[PDB]
Amino acid sequence: WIREYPPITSDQQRQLYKRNFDTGLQEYKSLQSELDEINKELSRLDKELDDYREESEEYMAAADEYNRLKQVKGSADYKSKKNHCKQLKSKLSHIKKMVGDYDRQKT
Numbered sequence: 001w002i003r004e005y006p007p008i009t010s011d012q013q014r015q016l017y018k019r020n021f022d023t024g025l026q027e028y029k030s031l032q033s034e035l036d037e038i039n040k041e042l043s044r045l046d047k048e049l050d051d052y053r054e055e056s057e058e059y060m061a062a063a064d065e066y067n068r069l070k071q072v073k074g075s076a077d078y079k080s081k082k083n084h085c086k087q088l089k090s091k092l093s094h095i096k097k098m099v100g101d102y103d104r105q106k107t
Contacts, residue, residue, distance in 0.1 A: 001094040008102035021095045028088040031081055038078070042069050 008014050045066045052059040072078055 001091050005091075005095050005098055008098055014099055014102050017095050017099050021092055021099070024088055024092050024095070028085060028092060031085050031088070035078065035082060035085065038069055038073055042066060042073075045069070 005017060005020075008017065045062050048062040049059060049066065052062060
């Protein structure tokens with residue numbers, strides 16, 4: 001990330017990094033919310049499996065949906081989005097560090 005976002009040498013470059021940080025943070029939060037939806041549904045289904053009797057149709061329905069969601073979680077789409085989030089998180093951490101370092105020396 002340093003080749004794209006090197007140490008800052010001006011206030012205008014700092015402002016540009018801040019704008020790019022905000023745009024990336026929006027993307028990161030949106031993708032993280034999408035990934036979180038599946039995990040929230042899986043957590044609610046785990047509780048349903050604890051609740052319902054094993055021989056019940058309710059238990060079989062919850063188990064079928066749990067497996068449908070695990071399949072989606074293991075899909076190329078979900079996993080690539082997870083990887084994209086890790087990349088964004090890394091980039092955002094780098095940009096924030098560059099901005100903090102520049103502000104630190106302006107005092």
